[PDB]
Design an enzyme around this catalytic site. Structure first.
Site, PDB file in Angstrom:
ATOM      1  N   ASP J  39     -13.400  12.912 -19.072  1.00 62.54           N
ATOM      2  CA  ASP J  39     -14.345  11.971 -18.477  1.00 62.54           C
ATOM      3  C   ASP J  39     -15.512  11.716 -19.425  1.00 62.54           C
ATOM      4  O   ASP J  39     -15.474  12.124 -20.580  1.00 62.54           O
ATOM      5  CB  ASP J  39     -14.850  12.495 -17.139  1.00 62.54           C
ATOM      6  CG  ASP J  39     -15.534  13.830 -17.265  1.00 62.54           C
ATOM      7  OD1 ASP J  39     -14.872  14.858 -17.034  1.00 62.54           O
ATOM      8  OD2 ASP J  39     -16.734  13.856 -17.597  1.00 62.54           O
ATOM      9  N   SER J  40     -16.548  11.042 -18.944  1.00 62.32           N
ATOM     10  CA  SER J  40     -17.630  10.642 -19.823  1.00 62.32           C
ATOM     11  C   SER J  40     -18.580  11.801 -20.101  1.00 62.32           C
ATOM     12  O   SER J  40     -19.252  11.788 -21.155  1.00 62.32           O
ATOM     13  CB  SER J  40     -18.397   9.457 -19.239  1.00 62.32           C
ATOM     14  OG  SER J  40     -18.944   9.788 -18.000  1.00 62.32           O
TER      15      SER J  40
END
Ligand SMILES: CCCCCCCCCCCCCCCCCC(=O)OC[C@H](COP(=O)(O)OCCN)OC(=O)CCCCCCCCCCCCCCCCC
Ligand SMILES: CCCCCCCCCCCCCCCCCC(=O)OC[C@H](COP(=O)(O)OCCN)OC(=O)CCCCCCCCCCCCCCCCC
Ligand SMILES: CCCCCCCCCCCCO[C@@H]1O[C@H](CO)[C@@H](O[C@H]2O[C@H](CO)[C@@H](O)[C@H](O)[C@H]2O)[C@H](O)[C@H]1O
Ligand SMILES: CCCCCCCCCCCCO[C@@H]1O[C@H](CO)[C@@H](O[C@H]2O[C@H](CO)[C@@H](O)[C@H](O)[C@H]2O)[C@H](O)[C@H]1O
Ligand SMILES: CCCCCCCCCCCCO[C@@H]1O[C@H](CO)[C@@H](O[C@H]2O[C@H](CO)[C@@H](O)[C@H](O)[C@H]2O)[C@H](O)[C@H]1O
Ligand SMILES: CCCCCCCCCCCCO[C@@H]1O[C@H](CO)[C@@H](O[C@H]2O[C@H](CO)[C@@H](O)[C@H](O)[C@H]2O)[C@H](O)[C@H]1O
Ligand SMILES: CCCCCCCCCCCCO[C@@H]1O[C@H](CO)[C@@H](O[C@H]2O[C@H](CO)[C@@H](O)[C@H](O)[C@H]2O)[C@H](O)[C@H]1O
Ligand SMILES: *C(=O)CCCCCCCCCCCCC
Lengths: 155, 170, 171, 459, 220, 126, 67, 120, 79, 84, 104
Positions: J39-40
């Protein structure tokens, strides 16, 4: 540069305000001149009073050292806000609190130096004793006169 | 080289070497090396230069100025007399500046020479400096940048008037 | 101008760097870097944006209170001890045109190759300008982005001062 | 003085009868020869001045001012010949003729025995200077600069003419040697107050005194480089030379009449030093720096002490070389970027290494680094003003701090930092420019080895 | 002071060069065995600075403290001097602990190298000076005062005692940074870190007021 | 404890209440601001990258700034209560203050010299 | 070079630097120990400090209350 | 320190004033008190160029030490015995100053104790 | 050109990174960057002296030379 | 003295010491989101690890665009004037 | 967050040019084309001592001996300390010893 592209008098009408904003390459909504007292600002824009240190250092500025882009309106006090002079950057401690602690520390130290001057530390000894009437001649006393004798006894 | 009366120096008293160590003194050998490597070659070069000077002996002289009537003898506005009196006063002013400079040099030399005993041992030089500075101040102080014999005379007459007044009332 | 996601990710990176400044020791930092990641993870799926903005707003206030007053700065980053240190050695390429002929004679091969780069720049300029003209909306460019070369044999418009810029360690 | 006046005059036929392409070579070569012979004026005596004739005399004050004047003409010619290259021949020869005529008026001004002769040559300098500014300046503002320069000068100078003519009627002579002996004290009356003002205001405007200085930043920003050099180096010193002579006949009234002008100068030097910190035009900064330096000279002349008069003389000579050098340094940048804005071209040390060295040396003399004669002059004034009143050290010391800040701010802004990316026409320093800077700094620093020759009569 | 203070900077230059211009002690550590000679010079210099008996700094600092203790002087100034002596042991420990001990905290590409003879010889000469220079100078200069050598035991040993306690207190503070507890900064910590705010206030307020006057009033 | 901004310590952007109230009107304003910057950036770059250009790219913004800081001031000056008081207080006030400081000091020193009570024992340089 | 960089490993060392560092560390400790063996007074006290409260009234010339 | 608490916190009327002591006659309670003897003459300390603060009642030991130092050059480790003699003489000089402080302290205490007799 | 040591050798076991992984395990968390720090706790970096050990560098040989130096001094003063 | 292959080796070395990445499915072209499932927040940590590895900062504006190992190599090679 | 395809292509094209430019900064083998044990360590130190110590000390000593010290008070020395029991070289005077000390 023609005269129409140079700073002019304070803008009186909304058309003038829209014209002044265009000359300075600003949105008419962002353009605000200095208050029209007799101080001589004319129509030059009033920009945020921020140091150039506050600008993004990762942006590809035309003038990286100044963090200025070509053609953008310069702050009236740009030369005071270069990165070598006045910084307005946010500080980890509030400005007002910072002044209280610095002044308070200085005031406390000055007080305690007066106290320590009024109540000096010293050793439990009498004065240092010197021969020959406290070295009257060596200290430059007049040979032709006579000091009252300074006598030191044994103990 | 210079007049010892003008620039006095007390007789020099050097102690003799009185060693209490068996180690050699590094300074003594360095002193000998300096005289051999530096002093002797330097002296030879100078002796050669003195030989050339001895071949071509010529003289210069210290200019002597006859005294002329001073400002007190000059009639008012007589520029021809005032000019010679003024030039003489200016020459004497320059000389008095150098007299003070000689006395200050004596005082400074005494302070260094006498070391830690200078306060007691330079009393005579400090007295002479004090007296000459007082005399020089009386003559020349407060005249301003545009000083002259006329202004200096006016200053003296004011001082004489005060001294007369104090003497009379006393 | 930064989206909500961009703001949240920038806060995470900034908070980890200040956290590392406090911890110093790697094992200690690893422990608290995981605890901090858990706090960001506890609200990862928040959907009500009003609630999320309030979380971000409060997190920035918490960061301000707990920031290191002297965080670690990479030496060459802005504000670092080596920032701008080598700028005095960066000399623009155009200075070489003013070299005396006897100075150029010392590097015959370098200056032959330089002459080819100037030829490439000259032959390419008009096409670069034309491409920018025909790809820019009528009002003007609305962002600072520049396009690539489209045709083969073309160069990306406005390339010279990026390609021929001084080296980071020019001496 | 005929051995200097006549060869100076001969420079005019020399320039006009030269081959078209040798006007700069010939005029420069022979003005340098005239400067060489000027050293013969160093025959000074401890008591008497060098009194040539009924018209001209030279003493320890006018001698260094003469040698500076004759030194500057060749430097001005070198400085001017580049921006005048495209001018047609006849108009070049006219420009050189104005420079020669200015030198002729100046050497006669500094050696005139009679105060009215001094006045006429003192005033003749306006004409060539005004012509140089308004005909060969680059900008529209030169016409207004000429008018401000002209009428500020004449506003004070015409009252001086009346006062001088009145003095000759009362005393019978304006010969300076005569006045040394026939001078009488000035008594308190409203008549003498205005006599004092008429005798001093013309010189105060030329210094310039703070409050009467507005013409100066105009004149520099508009003058060509040679006009700036002689304006800064010599023409300001007409005022200082004027007061040093005329104060002889104003005592003891100067005791209290000096107060308003000492206050303006003591406060003015701080105001004009602070102004330099926020100037955007490099030529205007150097111009304001002159106002601050000359404020010391005014104070030194007004308090009238042997130390202050020696400091005033050294300061006038030292500022002449420093300020003229700074204008030449700023002009060399201007010939490349064609703008006087200080912040426009930066990091020039990266591009012009040797020129940056001239910038450093001019800055260090401007802030009076010891033992430069700049420092010697300023220190002597500081020593004498402290005796005048101990509190002046606060103002003099503060001004020393500000002078360092703006001297080095100018150095840092233009020489250091990063170069401007888009300014790509900074060609290497020419031999002519480097020689021009060395002919300022080298004599300036050589004078540190023998300061007595620039300390004036009170030495 | 000239001997061991010059050595300390050169030792820090040795470390800074080895870590590719890194100057933050939080990114050092673990250099005690990797840079043995710089380590030795840094320890000797630190001990000389804090007044370890018979190193170069002991021959001036301990006489100064004894003279101050037995002098007729401001009592507050005397206490400030003694406390600052304890702080000298604290910040010296701070450099040794964070730079040399523990585990490395610098980047992975290891370029540590202090084997250049110019580096070694220059530090070596100052190391020899930092050991013997003070002893040699004190034994050759002529006496110019009467040193005060009679005093109570607690005035004689004050410099050593407060220095040792500084070392003990510094070690406890340093070792506490390894505990898995996260502390919040006090006002004293921020005051010390930001230099009592003197640069932050004075270097902003004084330039601003002076530069504002220069344009608004004097010029305009 | 909330951040208290000052003249010389700005409010951090992350703590700005308005940095999170980004409405459609504000986003529109930001786009317009970027449009001007991009337009000026393109005008500059077309000259900056031009291989045949040797010289200085004159910046009207810089010309307007130096002009505003000098030539434009008097034409827009009005003598009113504000400018008169500042003119009087700052221009005349310091001159009067220093006149009395020096006049008072010198009067005292002169009186002492005239009574022989000022010590000038070795004072012969002035 | 003569010392090659390593990745994630203890640096290469030379004998000269290790021995020289040890010799000067040992010289520091020999010097301290040697100096403290002869000059412990410089650390612990040169001369005894007397107890003023144990001086007799005779030797201080203090007359008895009735005098 | 101890004495400083007594004067600054306790009764300051029975503690010596270091800047005004002695305040009692030197022969008070001290019948036939001898004078301190000075071994070094004024001229000897003048030629030795002793610092004025060093020209005290121990100067003869300082002069002897200074001569040894010069005569033993370059051996800067000699004259330790002479240095100790001067140091020791200074120690006794200091102890004498300590006795003067204690003598004054006890006399001041006696006076107050006696001035209680004259009003009790 | 440069040979990087095999990456599989970097393990957190036997290091204080293992202690952290156990403290985080109690809470249900995991430290995924642990092996990237392991090299700082292994090899020639494994054991470093304490602060007292740093100050006592060279004490063993300094003390040995001291005893010999004073032993010789007593021997000479004996004769 | 960096090289293009030396940079790649160390960029992949760091990722092989990250517990959330299967060291066998890792290639220079793997997309941290589409290919590796990160994910980020994981992306931010990867960028921070690269800054520590090579000892310099990657600004957030640039950092957010580096989504595969090869882009990190290209970014680092560009900033350090590595051409081989 | 990731490069757009157009951004990817431009960076790729600029990347090719930049690497070609940097490769072009390498010097060729012939560039620059320039126009046309223990004992040797004693020599440099021997010649250096001669030109930087011996010659300057010859100049200074000559200058001091024959110009500076021929003028009054240019070099002033503190007079030597004289202790009891010393002998004066100039006169042969013998300074008497100090009195007999008391035992201490
Ligand atoms: C007596 C008369 C005194 C006269 C004093 C004149 C003061 C002039 C005021 C400065 C005018 C501005 C000049 C331009 C300089 C400038 O703006 O530089 C700003 C500079 C920034 O410094 P910095 O904080 O390090 O930031 C760098 C990181 N970006 O910051 C600076 O470097 C400027 C800091 C100096 C501020 C003045 C401090 C004065 C302190 C006086 C109080 C102490 C009194 C004396 C000491 C006590 C005596 C025992
Ligand atoms: C003494 C000066 C008096 C200062 C007190 C204030 C005077 C004043 O109030 O003048 C006001 C007047 C106009 O007032 P106002 O009602 O505001 O006009 C707009 C209304 N629609 O304004 C005027 O029009 C009158 C003009 C007043 C002239 C002021 C002169 C003094 C200004 C300072 C001069 C600085 C001198 C510098 C000295 C040399 C060194 C720098
Ligand atoms: C060996 C060292 C010897 C010298 C030691 C000197 C210590 C002297 C310190 C004096 C400075 C004390 O300064 C004082 O700090 C506290 C702590 O915030 C402030 O306290 C105040 O501000 C804080 C924060 O805004 C708030 O909780 C509240 O408004 C109030 O407590 C005081 O407004 C300030 O006056
Ligand atoms: C009875 C009283 C009469 C007094 C007259 C005294 C002067 C008489 C001069 C006569 C000669 C004049 O000379 C005439 O003018 C000039 C100056 O020389 C010459 O041409 C000139 O060209 C240039 C200047 O333009 C120069 O190189 C130089 O000045 C000269 O060569 C002409 O080619 C010549 O024809
Ligand atoms: C700083 C250098 C300046 C360079 C100047 C270049 C121009 C030089 C001009 C030289 C002028 C010489 O002028 C002439 O010199 C001769 C010397 O031979 C002098 O000759 C005379 O000098 C003196 C005069 O008291 C006497 O010794 C004697 O009467 C005679 O020798 C003349 O009095 C003078 O008229
Ligand atoms: C930048 C501006 C500078 C401005 C400087 C202003 C200086 C002002 C100087 C004031 C002194 C003027 O000179 C002074 O005038 C007064 C008259 O008022 C004269 O007064 C004279 O006439 C009056 C009659 O009223 C008599 O009482 C007095 O005996 C007589 O001296 C004084 O002789 C003189 O001392
Ligand atoms: C008048 C005398 C003046 C002072 C003279 C002092 C002389 C002292 C000479 C000491 C020489 C010691 O030489 C060095 O000692 C250390 C002792 O740890 C050895 O080091 C040894 O232990 C350390 C760990 O403790 C490791 O490096 C390794 O286990 C081993 O090498 C070095 O391998 C050896 O090279
Ligand atoms: C006894 O021999 C005296 C030794 C000096 C001790 C110093 C005491 C410090 C106390 C702090 C000062 C506070 C200000 C009154």
């Amino acid at each position: 540069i023609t005269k129409d592209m140079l700073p002019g008098p304070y803008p009186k009408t909304p058309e003038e305000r829209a014209a002044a904003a265009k000359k300075y390459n600003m949105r008419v909504e962002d353009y605000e001149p200095y208050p029209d007292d007799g101080t001589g600002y004319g129509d030059y824009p009033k920009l945020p009073d921020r140091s150039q240190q506050e600008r993004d250092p990762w942006y590809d500025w035309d003038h990286p050292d100044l963090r200025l882009n070509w053609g953008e309106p310069m702050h009236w006090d740009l030369d005071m806000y270069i990165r070598n002079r006045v910084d307005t950057s946010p500080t980890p401690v509030n400005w007002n609190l910072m002044c209280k602690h610095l002044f308070g520390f200085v005031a406390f130290m000055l007080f305690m130096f007066w106290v320590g001057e009024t109540y000096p530390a010293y050793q439990p000894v009498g004065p240092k004793q010197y021969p020959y009437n406290n070295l009257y001649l060596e200290r430059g006393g007049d040979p032709n006169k006579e000091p009252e004798p300074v006598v030191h006894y044994e103990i | 080289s210079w007049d010892k009366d003008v620039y006095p120096e007390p007789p020099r008293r050097t102690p003799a070497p009185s060693p209490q160590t068996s180690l050699p003194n590094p300074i003594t050998y360095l002193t000998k090396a300096f005289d051999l490597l530096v002093d002797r070659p330097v002296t030879l070069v100078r002796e050669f230069i003195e030989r050339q000077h001895a071949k071509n002996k010529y003289y210069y002289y210290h200019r002597e100025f006859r005294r002329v009537p001073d400002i007190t003898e000059c009639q008012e506005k007589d520029v021809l007399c005032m000019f010679e009196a003024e030039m003489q006063w200016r020459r004497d002013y320059k000389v008095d500046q150098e007299i003070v400079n000689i006395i200050q040099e004596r005082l400074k030399a005494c302070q260094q020479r006498e070391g830690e005993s200078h306060r007691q041992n330079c009393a005579k030089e400090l007295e002479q400096f004090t007296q000459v500075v007082k005399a020089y101040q009386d003559r020349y102080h407060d005249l301003g940048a545009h000083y002259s014999a006329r202004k200096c005379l006016a200053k003296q007459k004011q001082r004489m008037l005060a001294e007369r007044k104090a003497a009379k009332e006393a | 101008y930064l989206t909500h996601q961009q703001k949240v990710l920038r806060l995470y990176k900034r908070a980890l760097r200040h956290l590392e400044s406090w911890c110093i020791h790697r094992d200690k930092y690893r422990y608290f870097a995981c605890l901090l990641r858990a706090r960001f993870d506890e609200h990862k799926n928040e959907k009500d944006m009003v609630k999320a903005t309030q979380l971000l707003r409060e997190a920035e206030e918490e960061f301000w209170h707990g920031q290191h007053p002297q965080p670690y700065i990479f030496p060459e980053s802005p504000g670092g001890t080596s920032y701008e240190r080598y700028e005095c050695y960066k000399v623009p390429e155009w200075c070489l045109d003013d070299w005396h002929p006897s100075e150029k004679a010392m590097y015959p091969d370098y200056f032959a190759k330089r002459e080819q780069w100037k030829k490439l720049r000259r032959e390419s300029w008009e096409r670069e300008v034309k491409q920018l003209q025909e790809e820019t909306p009528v009002g003007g460019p609305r962002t600072e982005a520049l396009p690539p070369a489209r045709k083969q044999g073309d160069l990306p418009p406005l390339w010279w001062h990026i390609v021929t810029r001084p080296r980071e360690r020019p001496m | 003085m005929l051995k200097y006046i006549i060869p100076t005059i001969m420079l005019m036929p020399l320039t006009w009868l030269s081959k078209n392409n040798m006007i700069w070579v010939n005029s420069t070569a022979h003005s340098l020869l005239i400067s060489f012979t000027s050293l013969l004026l160093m025959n000074q005596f401890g008591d008497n001045s060098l009194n040539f004739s009924l018209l001209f005399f030279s003493d320890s004050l006018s001698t260094p001012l003469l040698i500076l004047t004759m030194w500057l003409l060749p430097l001005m010619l070198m400085a001017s010949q580049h921006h005048l290259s495209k001018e047609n021949l006849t108009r070049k020869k006219l420009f050189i003729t104005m420079l020669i005529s200015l030198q002729l008026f100046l050497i006669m001004t500094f050696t005139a025995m009679e105060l009215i002769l001094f006045y006429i040559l003192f005033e003749a300098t306006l004409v060539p200077t005004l012509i140089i500014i308004t005909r060969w300046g680059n900008q529209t503002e030169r016409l207004n600069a000429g008018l401000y320069f002209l009428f500020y000068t004449l506003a004070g100078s015409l009252p001086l003419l009346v006062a001088l003519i009145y003095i000759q009627n009362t005393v019978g002579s304006l010969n300076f040697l005569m006045l040394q002996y026939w001078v009488q004290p000035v008594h308190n009356s409203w008549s003498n107050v205005f006599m004092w003002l008429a005798c001093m205001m013309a010189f105060m405007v030329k210094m310039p005194l703070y409050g009467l200085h507005l013409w100066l930043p105009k004149a520099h920003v508009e003058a060509p480089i040679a006009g700036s050099m002689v304006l800064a180096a010599v023409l300001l010193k007409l005022g200082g030379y004027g007061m040093l002579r005329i104060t002889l006949i104003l005592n003891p009234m100067t005791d209290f009449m000096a107060y308003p002008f000492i206050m303006l100068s003591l406060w003015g030097m701080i105001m004009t030093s602070s102004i330099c910190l926020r100037q955007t035009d490099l030529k205007s900064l150097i111009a304001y720096s002159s106002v601050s330096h000359m404020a010391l000279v005014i104070v030194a002349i007004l308090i009238q002490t042997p130390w202050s008069y020696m400091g005033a003389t050294a300061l006038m000579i030292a500022h002449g070389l420093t300020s003229s050098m700074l204008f030449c340094l700023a002009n060399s940048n201007y010939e490349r970027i064609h703008s006087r804005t200080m912040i426009l071209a930066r990091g020039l040390q990266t591009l012009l290494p040797l020129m940056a060295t001239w910038w450093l040396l001019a800055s260090l003399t401007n802030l009076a680094l010891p033992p430069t004669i700049n420092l010697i002059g300023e220190l002597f004034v500081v020593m004498s003003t402290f005796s005048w009143s101990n509190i002046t050290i606060i103002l003099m010391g503060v001004n020393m701090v500000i002078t360092a800040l703006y001297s080095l701010y100018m150095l840092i802004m233009t020489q250091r930092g990063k170069y401007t990316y888009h300014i790509n026409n900074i060609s290497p320093s020419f031999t002519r420019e480097n020689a021009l800077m060395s002919l300022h700094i080298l004599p300036l620093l050589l004078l540190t080895l023998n300061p007595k020759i620039i300390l004036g009569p009170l030495y | 002071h000239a001997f061991f203070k010059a050595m300390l900077f050169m030792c820090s230059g040795s470390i800074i060069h080895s870590l590719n211009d890194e100057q933050d002690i939080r990114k050092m550590g673990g250099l005690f065995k990797a840079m043995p000679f710089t380590t030795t010079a840094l320890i000797v210099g630190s001990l000389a600075l804090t007044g370890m008996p018979f190193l170069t700094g002991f021959y001036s600092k301990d006489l100064i403290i004894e003279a101050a203790n037995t002098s007729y002087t401001n009592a507050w100034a005397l206490l400030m001097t003694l406390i600052a002596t304890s702080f000298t042991a604290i910040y010296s420990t701070r450099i040794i602990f964070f730079a040399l001990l523990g585990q490395p905290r610098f980047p992975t590409l290891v370029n540590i190298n202090e084997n250049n003879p110019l580096l070694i010889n220059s530090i070596k000469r100052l190391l020899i000076g930092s050991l013997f220079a003070g002893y040699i100078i004190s034994n050759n200069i002529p006496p110019t005062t009467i040193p005060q050598m009679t005093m109570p035991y607690y005035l004689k040993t004050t410099a050593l005692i407060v220095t040792i306690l500084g070392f003990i207190l510094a070690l406890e503070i340093s070792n506490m940074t390894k505990n898995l507890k996260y502390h919040y900064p006090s006002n004293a910590f921020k005051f010390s870190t930001l230099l009592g705010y003197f640069p932050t206030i004075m270097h902003r307020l004084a330039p601003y007021m002076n530069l504002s006057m220069s344009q608004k009033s004097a010029s305009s | 404890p909330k951040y208290e901004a000052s003249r010389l310590s700005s409010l951090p952007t992350t703590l700005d209440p308005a940095e999170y109230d980004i409405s459609s009107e504000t986003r529109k304003a930001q786009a317009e601001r970027l449009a001007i910057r991009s337009r000026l950036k393109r005008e500059y770059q077309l000259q900056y990258y031009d291989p045949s250009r040797r010289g200085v790219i004159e910046d009207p913004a810089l010309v307007r700034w130096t002009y505003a800081r000098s030539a434009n001031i008097y034409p827009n000056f009005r003598p009113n209560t504000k400018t008169s008081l500042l003119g009087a207080l700052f221009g005349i006030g310091p001159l009067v203050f220093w006149y009395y400081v020096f006049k008072t000091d010198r009067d005292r020193k002169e009186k002492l010299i005239q009574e022989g009570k000022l010590d000038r024992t070795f004072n012969i340089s002035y | 070079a003569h010392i090659e960089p390593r990745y994630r490993q203890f640096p290469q060392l030379t004998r000269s630097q290790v021995i020289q560092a040890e010799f000067f560390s040992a010289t520091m400790w020999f010097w301290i120990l040697w100096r403290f063996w002869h000059d412990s007074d410089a650390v612990l006290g040169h001369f005894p400090y007397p107890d003023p409260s144990q001086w007799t009234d005779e030797e201080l010339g203090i007359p008895p209350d009735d005098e | 320190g101890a004495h400083l608490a007594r004067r600054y916190l306790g009764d300051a009327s029975v503690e010596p004033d270091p800047l005004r002591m002695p305040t009692f006659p030197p022969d008070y309670g001290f019948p036939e008190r001898k004078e301190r003897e000075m071994v070094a003459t004024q001229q000897e300390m003048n030629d030795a160029q002793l610092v004025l603060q060093q020209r005290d009642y121990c100067a003869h030991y300082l002069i002897r030490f200074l001569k040894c130092k010069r005569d033993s050059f370059p051996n800067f480790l000699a004259c330790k015995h002479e240095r100790h003699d001067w140091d020791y003489c200074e120690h006794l000089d200091y102890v004498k100053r300590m006795k003067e402080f204690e003598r004054e302290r006890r006399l001041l205490q006696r006076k107050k104790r006696r001035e209680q007799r004259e009003a009790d | 050109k440069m040979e990087l040591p095999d990456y599989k050798q970097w393990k957190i076991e036997g290091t204080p990174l293992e202690t952290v992984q156990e403290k985080l395990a109690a809470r249900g968390l995991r430290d995924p960057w642990g092996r990237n720090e392991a090299w700082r706790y292994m090899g020639g970096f494994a054991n470093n002296v304490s602060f007292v050990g740093a100050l006592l560098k060279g004490f063993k040989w300094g003390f040995a030379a001291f005893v010999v130096a004073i032993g010789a001094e007593y021997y000479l003063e004996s004769q | 003295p960096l090289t293009l292959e030396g940079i790649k080796d160390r960029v992949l070395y760091v990722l092989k010491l990250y517990d959330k990445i299967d060291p066998e499915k890792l290639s220079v072209n793997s997309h941290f989101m589409k290919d590796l499932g990160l994910d980020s927040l994981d992306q931010v940590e990867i960028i921070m690890a690269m800054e520590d590895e090579f000892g310099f900062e990657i600004p957030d504006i640039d950092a957010e665009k580096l989504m595969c190992p090869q882009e990190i190599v290209d970014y680092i090679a560009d900033k350090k004037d590595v051409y081989e | 967050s990731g490069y757009t395809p157009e951004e990817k292509l431009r960076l790729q094209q600029l990347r090719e040019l930049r690497r070609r430019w940097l490769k072009d900064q390498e010097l060729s083998p012939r560039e620059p084309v320039l126009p046309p044990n223990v004992i040797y360590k004693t020599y440099r130190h021997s010649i250096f001592a001669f030109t930087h110590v011996l010659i300057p000390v010859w100049i200074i000593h000559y200058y001091l001996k024959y110009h500076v010290t021929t003028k009054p008070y240019t070099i002033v020395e503190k007079k030597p300390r004289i202790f009891p029991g010393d002998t004066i070289l100039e006169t042969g005077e013998v300074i008497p010893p100090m009195k007999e000390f008391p035992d201490q």
